[PDB]
């Protein structure tokens, strides 16, 4: 749109996510730090009246952040909550960890985990403007090396593209995820086993998650936003998966 278009904000069924209805519908989330876009996406401003306040809403880009592709795809219950805590994996920049911070509010915090120091410097710079973000530059494959910094997160979200996605998620969820906590994993079929096709990869990785006592609840292909992808949302049972 432009600088004169007006929209009506209607709350989405998932809490903390809002819908901007205009001539075209947009997916929007309320911002922590107003006035600056974390990656150049557009932003909506409302005014609410006591002297008035000007709270700013920020659009969620679907084609760059894979969580926003799954929301407009439609999920049963994405376990990332307005109050709970979320353990990101693979947040290089704030491509999606800004919006995940935006949907958990000031009451909950978000633990961004990444390896390389080149986007970790950006992750440092954003996390001191949104106070609910704390970054982990420590290696995501070994949860022992950063076990000081995270205590009993409620959700784990995977975006790392290493082929041992099942091992790196189980080793995080066995030590930091609560019981009955949500497991979201963005399965990329090219990054896991490129010799075999997409649905074989999806059947293999959801079976490895079942072996590590992570019950799957739903999967979504998120096809029109990204080719050859899926997100698997499920609950960490850990006591009688059957």
């Amino acid at each position: 749109a432009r600088g004169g278009a007006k929209v009506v904000i209607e709350p989405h069924r998932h809490a903390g996510v809002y819908i901007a209805r205009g001539k075209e519908d947009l997916l929007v989330t309320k911002n922590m730090a107003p006035g600056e876009s974390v990656y150049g996406e557009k932003r909506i401003s409302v005014e609410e009246p006591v002297p008035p306040t000007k709270v700013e809403y920020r659009v969620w880009n679907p084609f760059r952040s894979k969580l926003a592709a799954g929301i407009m795809g439609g999920l049963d219950e994405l376990f990332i909550a307005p109050g709970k805590k979320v353990l990101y994996l693979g947040a290089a920049s704030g491509t999606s960890v800004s919006h995940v911070s935006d949907v958990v509010g000031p009451e909950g915090v978000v633990y961004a985990v990444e390896f390389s120091h080149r986007p970790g410097r950006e992750l440092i710079s954003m996390a001191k403007k949104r106070p609910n973000i704390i970054p982990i530059i420590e290696d995501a494959r070994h949860p022992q090396k950063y076990r000081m910094l995270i205590g009993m997160v409620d959700c784990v979200f995977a975006d790392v593209a290493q082929p041992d996605q099942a091992r790196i998620i189980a080793l995080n969820s066995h030590m930091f995820l609560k019981d009955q906590g949500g497991v979201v994993i963005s399965i990329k079929a090219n990054c896991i086993d490129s010799t075999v096709d997409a649905e074989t990869v999806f059947a293999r990785e959801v079976q490895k998650l079942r072996e590590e006592r992570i019950k799957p609840l739903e999967q979504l292909t998120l096809e029109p936003y990204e080719r050859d992808h899926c997100i698997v949302v499920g609950r960490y049972m850990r006591s009688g998966l059957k």
Binding site: R13, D76, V196, D197, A198, E199, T200, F202, A203, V206, Q207, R210, E211, K215, Q219, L220, T221, E223, L241, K242
Partner: protein, 174 residues
């Protein structure tokens, strides 16, 4: 100054919550698989993983054909079999009169995979794995489960008859 038509207060038998039977007080559309055409399911490519039931196992013993190199003749491409933990539990629940077919089932060349069901029904597990993925190919030799998998598109089924197998929904029959 009484009210009129006084009636004795009794049990509102269709209304109260002290009964057991009155203790009762998001649209879902499953999308089609993105690797599926009208009827192709183009993700069916070598290597292949077959789902096996007991009627596939018992008839293969009846028709003198071992699994791994017997699958080689019909489907003609490289394929490895996998058997769910639910199926092998109920296959070996047949008992003593099929223990030779039990012994051919347990084999390092036949792969195995785990399960998660509060039950042991082979037909319900095989369909639910097929619905959630549209990735596997199924081996079945009874008409009840065969019609259940013929009604979902893009799922290749194979059976046995005569001396060797026969595939049904695969485009690459030769």
């Amino acid at each position: 100054t009484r009210k009129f038509g006084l009636v004795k207060r009794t049990l509102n038998t269709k209304k109260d919550q002290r009964l057991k039977k009155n203790q009762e007080n998001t649209r879902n559309i499953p999308q089609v698989s993105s690797a599926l055409f009208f009827q192709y399911n183009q993700a069916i490519k070598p290597p292949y993983q077959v789902l096996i039931d007991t009627n596939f196992i018992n008839f293969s013993i009846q028709k003198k054909v071992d699994i791994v190199r017997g699958m080689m003749d019909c489907l003609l491409a490289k394929c490895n079999p996998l058997i769910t933990d639910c199926v092998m539990a109920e296959l070996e629940k047949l008992g003593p009169k099929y223990r030779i077919a039990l012994k051919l089932a347990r084999d390092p060349r036949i792969k195995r995979l785990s399960c998660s069901h509060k039950g042991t029904y082979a037909d319900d597990c095989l369909v639910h794995r097929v619905l959630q993925h549209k990735c596997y190919i199924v081996a079945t030799n009874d008409a009840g489960l065969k019609q259940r998998i013929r009604k979902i598109p893009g799922i290749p089924l194979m059976s046995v008859g005569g001396h060797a197998y026969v595939i049904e929904k695969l485009p690459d029959v030769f």
